[PDB]
Amino acid sequence: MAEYGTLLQDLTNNITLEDLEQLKSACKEDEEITTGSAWFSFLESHNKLDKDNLSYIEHIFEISRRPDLLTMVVDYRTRVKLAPPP
Amino acid sequence: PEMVRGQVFDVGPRYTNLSYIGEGAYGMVCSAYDNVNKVRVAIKKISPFEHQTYCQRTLREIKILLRFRHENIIGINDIIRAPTIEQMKDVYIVQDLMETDLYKLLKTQHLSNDHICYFLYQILRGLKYIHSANVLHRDLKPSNLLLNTTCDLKICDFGLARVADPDHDHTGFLEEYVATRWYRAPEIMLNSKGYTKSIDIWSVGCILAEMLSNRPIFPGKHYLDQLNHILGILGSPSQEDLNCIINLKARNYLLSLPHKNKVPWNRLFPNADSKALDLLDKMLTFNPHKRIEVEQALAHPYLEQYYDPSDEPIAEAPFKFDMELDDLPKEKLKELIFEETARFQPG
Numbered sequence: 416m417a418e419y420g421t422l423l424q425d426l427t428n429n430i431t432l433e434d435l436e437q438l439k440s441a442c443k444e445d446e447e448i449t450t451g452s453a454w455f456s457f458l459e460s461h462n463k464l465d466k467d468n469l470s471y472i473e474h475i476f477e478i479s480r481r482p483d484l485l486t487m488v489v490d491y492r493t494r495v496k497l498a499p500p501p
Numbered sequence: 502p503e504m505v506r507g508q509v510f511d512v513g514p515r516y517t518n519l520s521y522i523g524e525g526a527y528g529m530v531c532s533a534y535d536n537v538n539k540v541r542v543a544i545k546k547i548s549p550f551e552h553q554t555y556c557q558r559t560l561r562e563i564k565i566l567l568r569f570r571h572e573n574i575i576g577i578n579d580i581i582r583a584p585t586i587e588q589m590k591d592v593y594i595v596q597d598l599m600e601t602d603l604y605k606l607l608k609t610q611h612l613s614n615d616h617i618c619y620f621l622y623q624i625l626r627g628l629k630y631i632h633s634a635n636v637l638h639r640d641l642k643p644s645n646l647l648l649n650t651t652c653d654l655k656i657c658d659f660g661l662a663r664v665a666d667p668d669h670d671h672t673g674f675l676e677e678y679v680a681t682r683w684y685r686a687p688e689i690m691l692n693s694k695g696y697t698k699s700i701d702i703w704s705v706g707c708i709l710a711e712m713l714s715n716r717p718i719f720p721g722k723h724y725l726d727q728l729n730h731i732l733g734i735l736g737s738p739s740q741e742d743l744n745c746i747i748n749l750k751a752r753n754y755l756l757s758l759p760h761k762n763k764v765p766w767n768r769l770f771p772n773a774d775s776k777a778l779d780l781l782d783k784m785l786t787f788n789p790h791k792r793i794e795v796e797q798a799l800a801h802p803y804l805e806q807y808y809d810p811s812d813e814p815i816a817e818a819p820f821k822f823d824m825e826l827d828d829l830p831k832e833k834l835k836e837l838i839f840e841e842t843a844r845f846q847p848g
């Protein structure tokens with residue numbers, strides 16, 4: 416419950432304002448005005464993120480080409496009759 | 502409305518006696534008797550035009566396939582759709598009925614060196630054409646290579662194809678429709694832009710290795726696992742290999758991984774032809790700039806007996822016209838689909 420928050424912070428410390436833009440583009444079809452940790456709490460309040468619901472961020476980190484981010488999610492989910500040619 | 506397996510398959514009075522072939526990437530696939538040409542054909546049903554990227558997938562598949570004329574690319578023989586745009590809720594593509602695909606074939610046979618050689622040639626022969634049209638297939642895999650027992654090979658499914666532009670920013674449209682990344686180029690997987698024709702060569706390389714041993718070369722289950730599989734065989738990337746990576750956060754990730762040694766190709770393919778592996782080594786080069794190009798591959802000593810530049814035709818209608826710039830209103834794409842398919846109506 417509280418260890419999910421520990422690695423929500425870990426992710427937020429590694430998302431610069433510019434990376435944030437590359438991440439929301441990856442959430443294409445799914446409002447602009449968000450900044451950093453506001454992204455996580457948007458996903459959470461649209462049922463795309465839980466302590467147990469990691470599917471979406473795992474996907475977005477791949478599309479955004481962020482193994483560094485995804486590696487933290489993985490790590491703290493593992494803890495928690497043919498004829499001859501011529 | 503003649504219908505197969507609980508689904509509506511309205512292929513008109515021309516195409517009759519339907520038989521379920523299998524479930525495809527666009528939907529149901531059937532064989533049908535073409536009453537005009539007196540032969541059995543293959544029919545793909547492509548349905549809901551309610552999702553934008555699916556309409557995209559359809560336009561690409563049509564537009565590209567419809568302006569290609571090559572021995573080693575499947576062609577569209579007919580398209581069935583409703584006369585009015587409002588009534589057009591699905592589209593039927595009609596192609597040559599092919600006996601099998603290379604996935605089904607490697608699933609059953611173990612191929613002789615001679616068979617592999619000819620198949621590889623045809624893949625590359627068809628590819629030389631695709632590339633000269635300025636087109637990237639992006640989905641080259643065994644299941645996308647159709648055969649019949651005469652050994653004629655036809656490259657199929659151009660729904661993920663894009664006009665070759667290194668300046669194109671990756672959107673995830675690729676992974677939206679293909680989750681398996683066994684045949685994905687390493688630079689596709691960690692860059693976000695700069696994809697060149699050499700992504701298709703990589704795939705063919707993967708297809709070659711899979712023809713030699715029937716097992717896929719890089720069968721990674723997930724994203725990070727696929728990277729690990731590549732470096733597991735190719736060895737940890739060199740000083741300038743790393744310089745191919747624009748994404749610094751990806752470059753650092755690869756550097757953080759433990760060192761892996763190169764596995765020599767002859768140790769992985771004990772009784773494969775020596776000429777076959779030297780070619781493979783060039784097709785599966787991490788560095789996309791060092792990696793062999795199509796025209797050069799055809800000229801490789803392994804394909805010595807099939808190589809004939811005069812019988813290797815290039816595209817006449819290349820995609821210089823149309824940078825293509827899709828990713829726009831879905832209602833507009835549906836119109837373009839209606840437009841492209843119009844040359845098969847009663848008129």
Ligand SMILES: Nc1ncnc2c1ncn2[C@@H]1O[C@H](COP(=O)(O)OP(=O)(O)O)[C@@H](O)[C@H]1O
Pocket residue numbers: 522523524525526527528530543575596597598599600601602644645647657658
């Ligand atoms: N031209 C054809 N003739 C006969 N069968 C075909 C033909 N094209 C495709 N099929 C079969 O239809 C099914 C799926 O079509 P498709 O979606 O193009 O394959 P994929 O899912 O790899 O893109 C498969 O069983 C495939 O082998």
